[PDB]
Amino acid sequence: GMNLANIVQRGWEALGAGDFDTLVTDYVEKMIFIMPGQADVLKGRQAFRSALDNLGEILPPGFEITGLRQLEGENEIVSIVEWKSDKMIASQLSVLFKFEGDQIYEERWFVDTEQWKSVF
Amino acid sequence: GMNLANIVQRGWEALGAGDFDTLVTDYVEKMIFIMPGQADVLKGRQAFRSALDNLGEILPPGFEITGLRQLEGENEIVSIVEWKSDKMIASQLSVLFKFEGDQIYEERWFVDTEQWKSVF
Incomplete structure (x- = not known):
């Protein structure tokens, strides 16, 4: 199949570039996005694209x-x-x-x- | 060399069993332990063993x-x-x-x- 680490890498670039239309093609419709906290659970690709x-x-x-690397499971x-x-x-x-x-x-x-919220 | 994922796995078991003397043999003397937050940086194996x-x-x-798996870099x-x-x-x-x-x-x-601190 397609190389998954590469998919992830390219998606960080799309995110950085604001190419959200391209980015979301990497995701299934019934996806879930848990961010920034474990209780912050958003369901669905349209809701993700909206956010x-x-x-x-x-x-x-x-x-x-400033640094990026991928580990494989x-x-x-x-x-x-x-x-x-x-x-x-x-x-x-880290992001899974x-x-x-x-x-x-x-x-x-x-x-x-705690740290994340303080830097806004 | 020795398999690193195995080292990690066995260390979760040592930690769970309170076998701290065995656990710390996996670490170098000038280690650093960042936990639970990114600003919580403890230096040295003796200080770690003490904690x-x-x-x-x-x-x-x-x-x-309740679940555990290892990813490799x-x-x-x-x-x-x-x-x-x-x-x-x-x-x-997650732990790196x-x-x-x-x-x-x-x-x-x-x-x-935020979540972690609330469950004590």
């Missing part, structure tokens, strides 16, 4: 990825994301992507939420 | 792992940990382990800290 139109307020001011990928922002000199988060075939059905962020 | 003597208060009351491993506790019906966290040779030098937890 992306407010990304500028979902990611903190000046959010920038069984039809799933984890990104380790090194980042900074206007109010954060350096931090890290589970795939149904070659499309993402679960995107689950593991974020220090 | 383990208060594990009962570092993990929430009734903390129990370049001399590093990520655990996805599905868990529950007295005050949590179900949650997930980076290795110097076959020993861990960085253990970095990615935890929803």
